Design a protein around this nucleic acid. Structure first.
Ligand SMILES: [Cu+]
Ligand SMILES: [K+]
Ligand SMILES: [K+]
Ligand SMILES: [K+]
Ligand SMILES: [K+]
Ligand SMILES: [K+]
Ligand SMILES: [K+]
Ligand SMILES: [K+]
Ligand SMILES: [K+]
Ligand SMILES: [K+]
Ligand SMILES: [K+]
Ligand SMILES: [K+]
Ligand SMILES: [K+]
Ligand SMILES: [K+]
Ligand SMILES: [K+]
Ligand SMILES: [K+]
Ligand SMILES: [K+]
Ligand SMILES: [K+]
Ligand SMILES: [K+]
Ligand SMILES: [K+]
Ligand SMILES: [K+]
Ligand SMILES: [K+]
Ligand SMILES: [K+]
Ligand SMILES: [K+]
Ligand SMILES: [K+]
Ligand SMILES: [K+]
Ligand SMILES: [K+]
Ligand SMILES: [K+]
Ligand SMILES: [K+]
Ligand SMILES: [K+]
Ligand SMILES: [K+]
Ligand SMILES: [K+]
Ligand SMILES: [K+]
Ligand SMILES: [K+]
Ligand SMILES: [K+]
Ligand SMILES: [K+]
Ligand SMILES: [K+]
Ligand SMILES: [K+]
Ligand SMILES: [K+]
Ligand SMILES: [K+]
Ligand SMILES: [Mg+2]
Ligand SMILES: [Mg+2]
Ligand SMILES: [Mg+2]
Ligand SMILES: [Mg+2]
Ligand SMILES: [Mg+2]
Ligand SMILES: [Mg+2]
Ligand SMILES: [Mg+2]
Ligand SMILES: [Mg+2]
Ligand SMILES: [Mg+2]
Ligand SMILES: [Mg+2]
Ligand SMILES: [Mg+2]
Ligand SMILES: [Mg+2]
Ligand SMILES: [Mg+2]
Ligand SMILES: [Mg+2]
Ligand SMILES: [Mg+2]
Ligand SMILES: [Mg+2]
Ligand SMILES: [Mg+2]
Ligand SMILES: [Mg+2]
Ligand SMILES: [Mg+2]
Ligand SMILES: [Mg+2]
Ligand SMILES: [Mg+2]
Ligand SMILES: [Mg+2]
Ligand SMILES: [Mg+2]
Ligand SMILES: [Mg+2]
Ligand SMILES: [Mg+2]
Ligand SMILES: [Mg+2]
Ligand SMILES: [Mg+2]
Ligand SMILES: [Mg+2]
Ligand SMILES: [Mg+2]
Ligand SMILES: [Mg+2]
Ligand SMILES: [Mg+2]
Ligand SMILES: [Mg+2]
Ligand SMILES: [Mg+2]
Ligand SMILES: [Mg+2]
Ligand SMILES: [Mg+2]
Ligand SMILES: [Mg+2]
Ligand SMILES: [Mg+2]
Ligand SMILES: [Mg+2]
Ligand SMILES: [Mg+2]
Ligand SMILES: [Mg+2]
Ligand SMILES: [Mg+2]
Ligand SMILES: [Mg+2]
Ligand SMILES: [Mg+2]
Ligand SMILES: [Mg+2]
Ligand SMILES: [Mg+2]
Ligand SMILES: [Mg+2]
Ligand SMILES: [Mg+2]
Ligand SMILES: [Mg+2]
Ligand SMILES: [Mg+2]
Ligand SMILES: [Mg+2]
Ligand SMILES: [Mg+2]
Ligand SMILES: [Mg+2]
Ligand SMILES: [Mg+2]
Ligand SMILES: [Mg+2]
Ligand SMILES: [Mg+2]
Ligand SMILES: [Mg+2]
Ligand SMILES: [Mg+2]
Ligand SMILES: [Mg+2]
Ligand SMILES: [Mg+2]
Ligand SMILES: [Mg+2]
Ligand SMILES: [Mg+2]
Ligand SMILES: [Mg+2]
Ligand SMILES: [Mg+2]
Ligand SMILES: [Mg+2]
Ligand SMILES: [Mg+2]
Ligand SMILES: [Mg+2]
Ligand SMILES: [Mg+2]
Ligand SMILES: [Mg+2]
Ligand SMILES: [Mg+2]
Ligand SMILES: [Mg+2]
Ligand SMILES: [Mg+2]
Ligand SMILES: [Mg+2]
Ligand SMILES: [Mg+2]
Ligand SMILES: [Mg+2]
Ligand SMILES: [Mg+2]
Ligand SMILES: [Mg+2]
Ligand SMILES: [Mg+2]
Lengths: 93, 271, 46
RNA sequence: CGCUCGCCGGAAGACCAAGGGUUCCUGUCCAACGUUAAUCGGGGCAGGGUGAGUCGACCCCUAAGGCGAGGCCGAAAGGCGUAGUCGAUGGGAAACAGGUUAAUAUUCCUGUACUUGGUGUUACUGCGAAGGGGGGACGGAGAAGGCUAUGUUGGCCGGGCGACGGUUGUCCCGGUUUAAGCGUGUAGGCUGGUUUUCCAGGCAAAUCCGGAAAAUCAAGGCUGAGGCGUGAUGACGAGGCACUACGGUGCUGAAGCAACAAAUGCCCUGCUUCCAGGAAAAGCCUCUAAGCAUCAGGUAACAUCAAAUCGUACCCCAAACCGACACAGGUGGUCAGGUAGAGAAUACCAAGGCGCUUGAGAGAACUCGGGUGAAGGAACUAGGCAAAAUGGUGCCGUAACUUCGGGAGAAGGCACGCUGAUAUGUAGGUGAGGUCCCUCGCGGAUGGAGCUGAAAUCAGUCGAAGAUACCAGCUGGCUGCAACUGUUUAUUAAAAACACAGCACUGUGCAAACACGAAAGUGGACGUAUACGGUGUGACGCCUGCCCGGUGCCGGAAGGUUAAUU
RNA sequence: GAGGACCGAACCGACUAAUGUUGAAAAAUUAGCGGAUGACUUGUGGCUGGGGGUGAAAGGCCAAUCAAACCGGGAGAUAGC
């Protein structure tokens, strides 16, 4: 049992993009920004508990942050974790 | 047999092989094999400490029984074999109880021969006894220097030792070097001579044949510069000095034995 | 023509990395020196 | 964007490791960067993009080597190393085909699979390791056979009837693809099998391995490419049809066979042969010990659950890596089509990729890179430097000398294209139907349809020339030096120098001499005088003379002299 | 079907010439050249450290540095020039 307090911290935001929208309307898969240290099992439990939908499978990847310039200053955005969450057929989010 | 190669190429003109159509053609006996990787003549400081060693063929180590202390149980020679680790051939022997061992192959030993060790073994080639029980005047090999330590003298192909005398607890031996040496009579020895006497008749024939054996080139000191070797230097071929090692010690007759601990056992030096 | 710098990350880290520096007293004195100088990058360790 | 032209194509194509790190895709901008302009960019800015039980890492296991509790050694710092613990470049489970994005895909989707482990039932049951045994597990070269990848031709299906003479045909163009998995067990490779009794071996035990003695049977087992079947009534598929936001989308879809040739890939970790004699440890199989006893544990079937985490974009013979540059340099692995060809050479092409980020004119000297040259032909020059020349295959033929192998491709010379016949395509290779047999199958024998196919001879014929291009030895005579193949002054010296097999002297009895080291130790060597070190000489042939006064080395020890000490 | 065998690509070299010499390049390009089953060549990783290593020996090589590497220190060495 993953504690609800942990489940409430692992989902960070929906991910909005053309690929995400196509995933939702073609494969019943929603795309999320998730905490960097979240596992697939944690993501699955959090989606099921908080969004109240049944999940088929979770795929994950780590996005490396870009180096950016700002007023001659060089910086680097943080890496983050993206989750493609496939829902069971018939579920709607 | 000693076979001269035909001169179909300059590198084969001078080659002389020792071909023995009795050695096993298959693989060695695996339970008595160990790996043995190469050193390049370098010690654990990683420094070259013996020059002219490197490369050559990969070799597995055969565990050879130099102690010959399995007394009272006969063994039969199963086959003779090539051993890359030494000049002599070895023989795989099967004991009555089902144990197999490797021994140095004496001259004349062939598959089917029987061997034995111990105080009551027969006086026959390949049998091992304490020298107390071997007749004076006999020819023996694989001679111990301390009882139970294992054979250490006359192990190379074709070598043997003569038991010349027996006085009290000691026997006197004529070694291959010509030295007369006292050894405890409780030390063991194997009857006969080490086989493969034709080993010294081979001719390598080309440089590569030495490279196959792990021997790297010798560079003459007189071919170097003075910073490298006492012999180096000279506008042209010059020498003008007493021959020395690379470290400066005379190398044409100066003696280097210094062992007062073992002096008491040398009846007569080789010269 | 082959030049002198032929990069390998494993060799870089084994030769000059943080744990190699920590393995000897002389390497810990390199680190002490670079800290006293105030280097932003103490070692090659990426 | 289009049409044309040219260039690479064993790469200048495609794909990785390494290294780099957003360079990837889309929009937008042209200051600076880009050796020019730039509307373009690997440039600026913004947004997007990397989806795994099966690929890799992590992980289990070890090599060289590293570290190393105690330990041994050393003024200190430290050195070495035992038990151990790390360390890949090596050993260890499992996924394929098709479709899809602007950008990922063996990761997403469709279809069809597979592996390991945890639980829980059912049935049967001796399980148990830090120990024993097996296995893993290993070289070089060479030779075939059986195959596949792949190609070519025919058949089949669809389309065509030609910008200029001809083209309904023995004509032209295109396609003719299909995986892992599962089943079967073939060419081939290896091994006799089974059952009893006994035993100084495998640190104890062992039913396992090893050994000994009988009985009986003779075929039993292990391994194995390919093919065949299924996977697949599926997928893909030339083209056609309809819209386009003219970039491309949506629908449908024929044939989908055979013969021949054929690898450097597979059978093959095989086989034959040679000497220089060819890792380790775990996974895996098996044996028992202590111990546990209708318990645990094991075996099998079924069900269910789990297989986390990190990498995955993009460049990769390069404008993204190493070279200060968008630098004629360097960079390990994999793939390997057509015609000619021995070929991965070479020429022209395919797929695919490119015209090298200043151009426009002109048509002086001179420089660079090339082409041709009257007569002469080394007169040039230090020197034939450079250039010119030779150049293939088959056959004829080939001297001195020689260590009998060589020299030798010595030298020199002849033939060579195309067409027809021999022979509507030969010798040879391959091989279907049919027939016979069978211990009936992926079988044997016969049989030869079909396919493929040199080489030769005779006759004819075109050109100045038939190894026509690219490609592709110049040859001979005397002589110095080094025997030879090798090595060397990275960047002015490749040699006659170094090495070398062979030879000799000499040291070295093993705790070897010797070498690294205040030392412990380590190398020498798990070697032992037919061995190991040092030194000189340098294949081989015939040989290697005289001198021990000097210097050194070896032996001697009666005498002289002589240190600390007393 | 032997061989430090033979011809010859890849691969490893570097004998000659021209060019280049503020280079396309701080050692190359082009035409020729040698080895090409071996004393061969190559990837990954390891080991040897400065009077020290390694050296088929050229005082060669040890990061475009070698008759004693590089960096820091004694250090403002000393300099009848
Ligand atoms: Cu004295
Ligand atoms: K031997
Ligand atoms: K020499
Ligand atoms: K000299
Ligand atoms: K000299
Ligand atoms: K000289
Ligand atoms: K290093
Ligand atoms: K430029
Ligand atoms: K312009
Ligand atoms: K842009
Ligand atoms: K080790
Ligand atoms: K170790
Ligand atoms: K299961
Ligand atoms: K073999
Ligand atoms: K066809
Ligand atoms: K026409
Ligand atoms: K039998
Ligand atoms: K199949
Ligand atoms: K076991
Ligand atoms: K990818
Ligand atoms: K070409
Ligand atoms: K002009
Ligand atoms: K002009
Ligand atoms: K003719
Ligand atoms: K036929
Ligand atoms: K025929
Ligand atoms: K030729
Ligand atoms: K000579
Ligand atoms: K040369
Ligand atoms: K030399
Ligand atoms: K000697
Ligand atoms: K001779
Ligand atoms: K000779
Ligand atoms: K003399
Ligand atoms: K003398
Ligand atoms: K005296
Ligand atoms: K190697
Ligand atoms: K040196
Ligand atoms: K440096
Ligand atoms: K120095
Ligand atoms: Mg992932
Ligand atoms: Mg941050
Ligand atoms: Mg050490
Ligand atoms: Mg030597
Ligand atoms: Mg040896
Ligand atoms: Mg020698
Ligand atoms: Mg010299
Ligand atoms: Mg000197
Ligand atoms: Mg002279
Ligand atoms: Mg003189
Ligand atoms: Mg001296
Ligand atoms: Mg590398
Ligand atoms: Mg264009
Ligand atoms: Mg950028
Ligand atoms: Mg781009
Ligand atoms: Mg500009
Ligand atoms: Mg402008
Ligand atoms: Mg950009
Ligand atoms: Mg999935
Ligand atoms: Mg895998
Ligand atoms: Mg240690
Ligand atoms: Mg300690
Ligand atoms: Mg480990
Ligand atoms: Mg590995
Ligand atoms: Mg892509
Ligand atoms: Mg074992
Ligand atoms: Mg192996
Ligand atoms: Mg082999
Ligand atoms: Mg085929
Ligand atoms: Mg096929
Ligand atoms: Mg017409
Ligand atoms: Mg056709
Ligand atoms: Mg099929
Ligand atoms: Mg080959
Ligand atoms: Mg990719
Ligand atoms: Mg450019
Ligand atoms: Mg370049
Ligand atoms: Mg290369
Ligand atoms: Mg071709
Ligand atoms: Mg070519
Ligand atoms: Mg094309
Ligand atoms: Mg002109
Ligand atoms: Mg000119
Ligand atoms: Mg000309
Ligand atoms: Mg002329
Ligand atoms: Mg003319
Ligand atoms: Mg003329
Ligand atoms: Mg003439
Ligand atoms: Mg003249
Ligand atoms: Mg003149
Ligand atoms: Mg010339
Ligand atoms: Mg020419
Ligand atoms: Mg001649
Ligand atoms: Mg065929
Ligand atoms: Mg040419
Ligand atoms: Mg002369
Ligand atoms: Mg020579
Ligand atoms: Mg070299
Ligand atoms: Mg030079
Ligand atoms: Mg040169
Ligand atoms: Mg020792
Ligand atoms: Mg010692
Ligand atoms: Mg030792
Ligand atoms: Mg000489
Ligand atoms: Mg005298
Ligand atoms: Mg004396
Ligand atoms: Mg050769
Ligand atoms: Mg060189
Ligand atoms: Mg060249
Ligand atoms: Mg040659
Ligand atoms: Mg060649
Ligand atoms: Mg110093
Ligand atoms: Mg000199
Ligand atoms: Mg240098
Ligand atoms: Mg000095
Ligand atoms: Mg001072
Ligand atoms: Mg000063």
């Amino acid at each position: 049992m993953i504690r609800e307090e942990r489940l409430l911290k692992v989902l960070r935001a929906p991910h909005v993009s053309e690929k995400a929208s196509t995933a939702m309307e073609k494969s019943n898969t929603i795309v999320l920004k998730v905490a960097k240290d979240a596992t697939k099992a944690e993501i699955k439990a959090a989606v099921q508990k908080l969004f109240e939908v049944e999940v088929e499978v979770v795929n994950t990847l780590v996005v490396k942050g870009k180096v950016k310039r700002h007023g001659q200053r060089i910086g680097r955005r943080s890496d983050w974790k993206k989750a493609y969450v496939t829902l069971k057929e018939g579920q709607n989010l | 047999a000693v076979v001269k190669c035909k001169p179909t190429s300059p590198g084969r003109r001078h080659v002389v092989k020792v071909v023995n159509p009795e050695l096993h053609k298959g693989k060695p006996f695996a339970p008595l094999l160990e790996k043995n990787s190469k050193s390049g003549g370098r010690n654990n400081n990683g420094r070259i400490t013996t020059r002219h060693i490197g490369g050559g063929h990969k070799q597995a180590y055969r565990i050879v029984d130099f102690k010959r202390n399995k007394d009272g149980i006969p063994a039969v020679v199963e086959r003779l074999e090539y051993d890359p680790n030494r000049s002599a051939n070895i023989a795989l022997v099967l004991y009555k109880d089902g144990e197999r061992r490797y021994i140095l192959a004496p001259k004349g030993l062939k598959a089917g021969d029987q061997i034995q060790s111990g105080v009551d073994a027969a006086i026959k080639p390949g049998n091992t006894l304490p020298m107390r029980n071997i007749p004076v005047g006999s020819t023996v090999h694989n001679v111990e220097m301390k009882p139970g330590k294992g054979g250490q003298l006359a192990r190379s192909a074709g070598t043997y030792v003569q038991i010349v005398a027996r006085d009290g607890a000691y026997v006197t031996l004529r070694l291959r070097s010509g030295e007369m040496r006292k050894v405890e009579a409780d030390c063991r020895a194997t009857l006969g001579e080490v086989g493969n006497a034709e080993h010294m008749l081979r001719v390598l024939g080309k440089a590569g044949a030495a490279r196959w054996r792990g021997v790297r080139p010798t560079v003459r000191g007189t071919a170097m510069n003075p910073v490298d070797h006492p012999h180096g230097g000279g506008e042209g071929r010059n020498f003008g000095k007493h021959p020395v090692t690379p470290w400066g010690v005379q190398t044409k007759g100066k003696k280097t034995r210094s062992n007062k601990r073992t002096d008491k056992f040398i009846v007569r030096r080789r010269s | 023509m082959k030049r002198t710098f032929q990069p390998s990350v494993l060799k870089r880290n084994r030769s000059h990395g943080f744990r190699a520096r920590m393995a000897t007293k002389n390497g810990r004195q390199v680190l002490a020196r670079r800290r006293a100088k105030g280097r932003a990058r103490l070692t090659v360790s990426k």
